Write a protein that binds this ligand. Structure first.
Ligand SMILES: c1cnc2[nH]ccc2c1
Ligand SMILES: c1cnc2[nH]ccc2c1
Ligand SMILES: [Cl-]
Ligand SMILES: [Cl-]
Ligand SMILES: [Cl-]
Length: 163
């Protein structure tokens, strides 16, 4: 584990992360997809062999010795707010299990269900709080990757508030 486990946020492509493993914002079918998923497909295409897995689960596939944890958040265009919220919490708990099993000291993670799966709503706080609930009991250094400068400021503030 990390010497002093931390949360950090960076505004850059998760495909260029400096961590020992990556979480993909996957689709259930292991398809190349869009956004984070397409960047992951371009960087680690070997990791999409038998990566298909249901909503609310995570499945790890190695690209060489580099682990890609395919985490399937709910599409809020299909789920109720209540059922979506349950599956989103579950996907992050499955990520925590995988990160623990792999024995990594660090992990790069996007905010699940906040892009094209958001059902047109701002889910920064919802997704981030489920991330914390899952990862708080792990000792890996967590680095959150986002696109938007306003999201970087809000994620940074939320991390600092707990410190
Ligand atoms: C691709 C993905 N995420 C990004 N954040 C800042 C620039 C950039 C490009
Ligand atoms: C957030 C972080 N990294 C990304 N790569 C491609 C899109 C995206 C969004
Ligand atoms: Cl970048
Ligand atoms: Cl998404
Ligand atoms: Cl983002």
């Amino acid at each position: 584990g990390a010497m002093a486990p931390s949360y950090r946020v960076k505004r850059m492509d998760i495909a260029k992360n400096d961590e020992e493993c990556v979480v993909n914002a996957a689709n259930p079918r292991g398809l190349p997809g869009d956004g984070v998923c397409k960047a992951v497909y371009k960087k680690w295409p070997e990791s999409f062999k038998n990566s298909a897995t249901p909503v609310g689960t995570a499945k790890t596939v190695m690209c060489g010795t580099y682990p890609v944890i395919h985490a399937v958040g709910p599409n809020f265009s299909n789920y109720t707010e209540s059922e979506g919220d349950r599956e989103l919490a579950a996907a992050y708990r499955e990520v925590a299990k995988e990160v623990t099993r792999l024995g990594v000291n660090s992990v790069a993670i996007p905010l699940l269900s906040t892009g094209v799966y958001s059902g047109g709503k701002d889910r920064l706080t919802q997704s981030l709080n489920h991330l914390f609930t899952a990862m708080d009991s792990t000792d890996a250094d967590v680095v959150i990757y986002c696109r938007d400068k306003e999201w970087e400021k809000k994620i940074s503030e939320a991390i600092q508030m707990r410190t």
